[PDB]
Design a protein around this ligand. Structure first.
Ligand code: T5D
Ligand code: T5D
Lengths: 304, 304
């Protein structure tokens, strides 16, 4: 029993992290097969970042200007290309520790583990969600760019995120591993305001089911609701709308606990309207939205 | 910027996890050099667990009764001994992935990462604290016993915990890697009530400093206090007493932020007396006590 904000074991990803230096800029790269993936802003001075023309900056760069270090061994760069906002450095050595992997573009509300790295070296691992405004709330200091977000399905790492940017409001923006930003963000030091950080309703409901499964039941009430009624209350509280797709996804948890999804919606409705009155659910004083329904089933069943 | 509940990268520990089977019981073992460490209750039926005589149960066991599997390869057991509440299975092969390591017995309030494992296979990693009542609040299903808690200092894994027990109240109890329980707990299925789960005051203060460093400053007030005055309020709120040792440990964070420790105590005092009034600190609606001062400095500086 017990329910924790749990990251994927990071070993398979630790084995892929390298240091990339271009001039005076050092950040992290991801070494998969004979390609190293890193943010294209590795080629920028902090001055460049105000208004960079990446194509023009890149013309001035040769293979030998990209210093790639894996542990304390240098990799030989034999090619480089820009794909969207990432550089692909071709090296002459396939990473011997390359796991089975995929590049996936996640949807808002989807969760993933981040391996925070500095100078190609892992500092820690934590669990994130892609926010509905396509920001993440991470822990990223200077040097952390090129740190990656991932899911693991048994032995296959799905890479979904590479860290590029802290917005002036201290939230985080990055790309998939094709170098396309999540949301409307750009790799430029400019006014970039995030939109409304709404609560991921389906995730909150999953976590309420996790709470019931783990003995925290005080918030269960005698009420039910409808999707339309619930959604009026959700809108008012800056909660994402709940769809029949979300109800379907919660079916297995509904089944396991014998609490109909719409009954759990009615519990959530009362919690929104009445608050926690100083009580906690799974050691939280607020409604937790960084567990997917899949996360709750995985952790409640013990998948490896 | 940003501050996350962050675990150590788990790769070095993933490389040490094996499956141990004795009869119908499968749990996890830790393979370091040519020794596999596992909970001695691997030799118990669920019936045995009501009132086990471990010495008598062990007499009936031979090396060949301990099935040790590392990935899909069997290890040959060439010796076995009981040390306190752990078994040490001597195997004929040193673990090739053995990291530099130490066995440490942590104090209450100290934090560590758990690698949750089932059948010798990692499912996830999360950050814990040893509670002042010598319980931990983990995520441990059946099969998770032998999962370990650790700290990493650069390249040296300090193992501090091995999972043994869920108490009837759903909190967790285990041993150091010499097999000595934290607190008064025993590996017997019996009435074992935890004492008062007090808040780790020095950790809350560290996290308030982390909040200031990360721009969350709304709780800073115009007041100061004394250790004795603060401690009267702490006692009332089931907070651990604050000692001059704790004040000293917070010195570097005091220095960095220019907030005297006793001023931060006076902020914490008001938060205890007034509550959060529906506000959050680093995305928490309650005062977080699972970051040590060392944790806050590590994460705020980017140690790898
Ligand atoms: O399940 C919720 C938690 C718990 C509570 C009691 C026992 C064990 N675990 C609290 C915070 C995260 C883990
Ligand atoms: O620092 C606190 C958190 C944050 C908030 C804003 C931006 C980035 N990170 C919220 C929860 C954990 C991370």
């Amino acid at each position: 029993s017990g329910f924790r904000k749990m990251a994927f074991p990071s070993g398979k990803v630790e084995g892929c992290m390298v240091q990339v230096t271009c001039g005076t800029t050092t950040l992290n790269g991801l070494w998969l097969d004979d390609v190293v993936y890193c943010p294209r802003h590795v080629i920028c001075t902090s001055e460049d970042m105000l208004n960079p023309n990446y194509e023009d900056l890149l013309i001035r760069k040769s293979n030998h200007n990209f210093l790639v270090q894996a542990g304390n061994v240098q990799l030989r760069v034999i090619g480089h290309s820009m794909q969207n906002c990432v550089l692909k450095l071709k090296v002459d050595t396939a990473n011997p520790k390359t796991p089975k992997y995929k590049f996936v573009r996640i949807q808002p509300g989807q969760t993933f583990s981040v391996l925070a790295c500095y100078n190609g070296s892992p500092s820690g691992v934590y669990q994130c969600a892609m926010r509905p405004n396509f920001t993440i709330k991470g822990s990223f200091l200077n040097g952390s760019c090129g740190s990656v977000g991932f899911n693991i399905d048994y032995d296959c790492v799905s890479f979904c995120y590479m860290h590029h940017m802290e917005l002036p409001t201290g939230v985080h923006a990055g790309t998939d591993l094709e170098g396309n930003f999540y949301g409307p963000f750009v790799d430029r030091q400019t006014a970039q305001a995030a939109g409304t950080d709404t609560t991921i309703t389906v995730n909150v409901l999953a976590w309420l089911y996790a709470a019931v499964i783990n003995g925290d039941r005080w918030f269960l009430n005698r009420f039910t609701t409808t999707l339309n009624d619930f959604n009026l209350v959700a809108m008012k509280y800056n909660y994402e709308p709940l769809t029949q797709d979300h109800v379907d996804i919660l079916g297995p948890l509904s089944a396991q606990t014998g609490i109909a999804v719409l009954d759990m919606c009615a519990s959530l409705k009362e919690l929104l309207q009445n608050g926690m009155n100083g009580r906690t659910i799974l050691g939280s004083a607020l409604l937790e939205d960084e567990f997917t329904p899949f996360d709750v089933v995985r952790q409640c069943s013990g998948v490896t």
